[PDB]
Amino acid sequence: GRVLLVGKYRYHDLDELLVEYVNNVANKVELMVSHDKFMSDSLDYVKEWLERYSKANGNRSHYIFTFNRKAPGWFFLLFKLNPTSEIKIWNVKALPDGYLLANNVYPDTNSLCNGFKTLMSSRR
Amino acid sequence: KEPIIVLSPAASSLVRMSNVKEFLQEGKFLDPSKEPASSSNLLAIQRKSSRFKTPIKLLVVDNVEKLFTKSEYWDRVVAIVTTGKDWQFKNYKYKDPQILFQKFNGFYFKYKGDAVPASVKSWNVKVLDIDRVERFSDRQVVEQFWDTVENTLVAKRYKS
Amino acid sequence: PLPVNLRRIIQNAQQIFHLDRAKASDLTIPEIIHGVRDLCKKLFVLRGENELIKEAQQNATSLFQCLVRARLATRRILEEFRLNRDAFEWVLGTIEAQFQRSLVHPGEMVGVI
Amino acid sequence: MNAPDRFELFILPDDVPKLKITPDSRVPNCIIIKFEREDHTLANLLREELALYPDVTFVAYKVEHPLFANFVMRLQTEEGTRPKQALERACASIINKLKTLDHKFNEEWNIKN
Amino acid sequence: QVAGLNVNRNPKFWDIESENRDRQEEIDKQREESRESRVIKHPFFHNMKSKE
Amino acid sequence: ELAILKEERTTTPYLTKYERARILGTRALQISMNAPVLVDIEGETDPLQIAMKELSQRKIPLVIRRYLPDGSYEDWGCDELIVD
């Protein structure tokens, strides 16, 4: 087909679609993986590690990222405010322009972390 | 400051980052479809010429979005490789292909006997043919490409 | 009259690779000898491993091999033409390809011609 | 039998535009103009007028075939000037030249009448 | 105007159920069609299943 | 019996001009008779041009059978014959 649509994104050829969408998504995924707050292990192990780290460091709120094995192309953001606070998981989508969290597009992982902290502060 | 050679990130390109080093430098052409994809978008090659006493070091860049933040980098561009696709030039210095191709050297690589795309014929770019079977002409084609590039380099009075 | 023009090939190589200037060649003598010797065995007019086929194939290219050896001598290559390596493999490949292209095509109605 | 109508030399069909302009991308700031139902009378006038402008670096025309009434003109100006503006300036300048020529001829004819 | 015949369709002497069943049989036969595979020429295109 | 094994094929490995012309004609006719096309067509519409495009990419699904004078023959695929 002369016109290709991937959600709201519109492309004109297979190579254009590939380069503009898939390469950017892969780069953002690598940036998320290379980020200091990433863990590719299983969700239960991520929850256990977060619980242990929060119990050991109950003076701060800890957030980590992990793979969304059920929904490919997504990420689970698990954050625990304190040992007494329940672990809350948020959904992050790997988009070509960045990461979509709470209907907000963040160009980089550090920008995503700053936005998450600002959202937590505002909701608090 | 090393000059820059720009390649098309298109998958149909006959010259990609995976096989650019063996082609432009070593003179041997390999099919890029069979070669594994290269993770690095920056590469460095060495050119030996009779016009220059010493070999010239050049930088090969596939995507200019993350490497052309400054306008002064465009002064180092000595060759542009395109696949005849308009969408390559969305983020370029001259978003119109024509002006880019009068202000820069454009090269299009096609197999011998294949028909040239219409947009390529409407642009000011050189056409370089690579035979599908015989491999001795790869050095000749590379020599033509480097002849054009060296003419541009000498015209720019580059220091090496 | 003989196939594939050698003079044209050599001057094309000289123009392509810029074989002017007093620069010294990097083409060793054994490469020249072995390259020409191997080229004189890849001019296939007849395919097959039969001994009689090999004898006919050797007979069919005697004059042309004499021409090639007369032109691509060691002294002439190093001094008169001043080819370098890359020009030398280019010349050998071009000679082989043009010779293959100059053969007669099965199905010619040569009697009427 | 196959002779075309003579009025086709100057009568323009409705679907055929009198003047089609297409850019020439091989060189910067160049256009190709196709005049329909015209010949050397307009073409040579325009060409020799434009050749004198300092900002016009290339101007030429050709009639592809005498049996077809059209010609194609190539124009290529400096960086500052758009070629179509140069063509308009040429047309206006020739019009003024013809106007003053007519006025002077009328004066002379009245004097010598 | 399709069933222009005046044939008495009394259930006592006419098997309406059989004719109806045959009618959905033939209508489902009409719904039945054919499909074939798609061929695309692209370096990164491969005719594979999801698991494949 | 009459067929010659692939290992002992001694004819030329190149597509002669007569074979090229006949292959192009047959493929063009078949395409004009609504045969499937094995290459992607950008904007081409002429059957002969599509056939030439197929031949350049070694995608023509035809076999050349070369008849030796004694009656034996060699079967060459158009995908394994070298074309200039």
Q: Read out DSSP for B49-70?
A: -SS-SSPEEEEEES-STTT--S
| Chain centroid, CA D39 distance in Å | 9
**Contact status, residue B112 vs residue B79, Cβ threshold 8 Å:** no
**C48, C101, C107 member nearest F84 (Cβ):** C101
Residue C51, classed as helix, strand or coil, is helix
Q: Which two tokens stand for residue B64?
A: 């200019």
Element (H, E) at B126: strand B126-130
Give C-chain residues touching B140 at CB under 8 angstroms: 16, 90
Element (H, E) at D2: none
Angle at A118 between CA A112 and CA A124, to 5 degrees: 135
- Give which of B86, B89, B100, B102 to mutate to test D binding, by max D Cβ within 10 Å: B102
Q: Considering its fold, how many domains does chain D have in total?
A: 1
Give the determination technique: cryo-EM
Q: Cβ-count burial of F55 within 10 angstroms (0-12 exposed, 13-18 middle, 19+ buried)?
A: buried
Is A19's CB within 8 Å of B83's CB?
no
Is F16's CB within 8 Å of C101's CB?
no
Rounded Cα distance, B45 and B38, in Å: 15
Give F-chain residues touching C100 at CB under 8 angstroms: 14
Instruction: Residue window 30-69, chain C: list those with CB within 8 Å of chain F.
Output: 47-48
Nearest to F47 by CA among F22, F20, F25, F77: F25
Is B12's CB within 8 Å of E44's CB?
no
Residue C9: Cβ within 10 Å count: 17
**Contact status, residue B80 vs residue B64, Cβ threshold 8 Å:** no
The sheet carrying B42-47 orders its strands as B42-47, B56-61, B4-6, B77-81, B106-111, B126-130
Rounded Cα distance, B108 and B13, in Å: 9
DSSP single-letter state for residue B115: P
> Tokens 């077809």 — which residue?
D68
User: E strands within chain A?
Assistant: 4-6, 9-11, 62-67, 74-80, 88-95, 98-101, 104-106
> Tokens 């993770």 — which residue?
B39
- Domain ranges, ordered by start, for chain F: 1-84
Rounded Cα distance, B110 and B84, in Å: 11
**Contact status, residue D36 vs residue D45, Cβ threshold 8 Å:** no
Residue E49, classed as helix, strand or coil, is coil
> Tokens 């480097």 — which residue?
B146
Q: Which two tokens stand for residue C54?
A: 């090999």
What chain E residue is nearest to A18 in terms of C-alpha separation? E44
Rounded Cα distance, A36 and B101, in Å: 43
Phi-psi region of C107 (alpha: psi -120 to 50; beta: other; left: phi over 0): left
Give C-chain residues touching F73 at CB under 8 angstroms: none
Residue C5: Cβ within 10 Å count: 11
Rounded Cα distance, B107 and B6, in Å: 10
DSSP single-letter state for residue C77: I
* Residue D88: CATH number of its domain: 3.30.1360.10
> Tokens 């649509």 — which residue?
A5
What chain B residue is nearest to C98 in terms of C-alpha separation? B134
Element (H, E) at D11: none
Q: What is the resolution of this structure in A?
A: 3.1
Residue D37: give the domain boundaries.
Answer: 1-113
Give A-chain residues touching B87 at CB under 8 angstroms: 12-13, 16, 20
Element (H, E) at A59: none
List chains touching E (3+ CB pairs under 8 A).
A, B, F
Domain over F1-84 is classified CATH 3.90.940.10: yes
What chain E residue is nearest to A13 in terms of C-alpha separation? E42
Going by DSSP bridges, is the β-strand pair D56-62/D70-77 parallel, antiparallel, or unpaired? antiparallel
**Contact status, residue F45 vs residue F31, Cβ threshold 8 Å:** no
Angle at E40 between CA E35 and CA E41, to 5 degrees: 160
Residue B136: Cβ within 10 Å count: 17
Element (H, E) at A117: helix A109-123
The CA distances from residue D101 to B157, D21, D98, F72, in Å, are: 54, 31, 5, 89
Binding-site residues on chain E for chain F (CB distance < 8 A): 39-42
Q: Is B33 on the interface with E (CB under 8 A)?
A: yes
> Tokens 């083409």 — which residue?
C27
Rounded to the nearest angstrom, the minimum Cα separation between E40 and chain F is: 7
Give B-chain residues touching F56 at CB under 8 angstroms: 111, 113-114
Angle at B101 between CA B39 and CA D35, to 5 degrees: 145
Q: Is F32 on the interface with C (CB under 8 A)?
A: no
Amino acid at E35: R
Element (H, E) at B45: strand B42-47
Rounded to the nearest angstrom, the minimum Cα separation between C48 and chain B is: 22
Q: Which two tokens stand for residue B105?
A: 């050297």
Q: Cβ-count burial of D38 within 10 angstroms (0-12 exposed, 13-18 middle, 19+ buried)?
A: buried
Start-to-end CA distance of chain F, whole Å, equals 33
Q: Which two tokens stand for residue A80?
A: 């625990």
Phi-psi region of B47 (alpha: psi -120 to 50; beta: other; left: phi over 0): beta
In DSSP terms, D73 is beta-bridged to D33, D61
**Contact status, residue B21 vs residue B45, Cβ threshold 8 Å:** yes
Is B85's CB within 8 Å of A23's CB?
no
C44-69 b/e with 16+ CB inside 10 Å = b? bbbeeeeeeeeeebeeebeebbeebe
**Contact status, residue D36 vs residue D70, Cβ threshold 8 Å:** yes
> Tokens 């007369």 — which residue?
C70
Q: What are phi and psi of A76, to 5 degrees?
A: -100, 120
In DSSP terms, B126 is beta-bridged to B107
List chains touching A (3+ CB pairs under 8 A).
B, E
**Contact status, residue C94 vs residue C9, Cβ threshold 8 Å:** yes
Element (H, E) at D32: strand D30-36
Task: Give the CA radius of gyration of chain D.
Answer: 17
Q: What are phi and psi of A108, to 5 degrees?
A: -135, 170
Angle at D83 between CA D82 and CA D84, to 5 degrees: 95
Rounded to the nearest angstrom, the minimum Cα separation between B3 and chain A is: 25
Give F-chain residues touching E41 at CB under 8 angstroms: 38-40
The CA distances from residue F41 to B15, B131, F45, F47, F50, in Å, are: 23, 22, 8, 11, 7
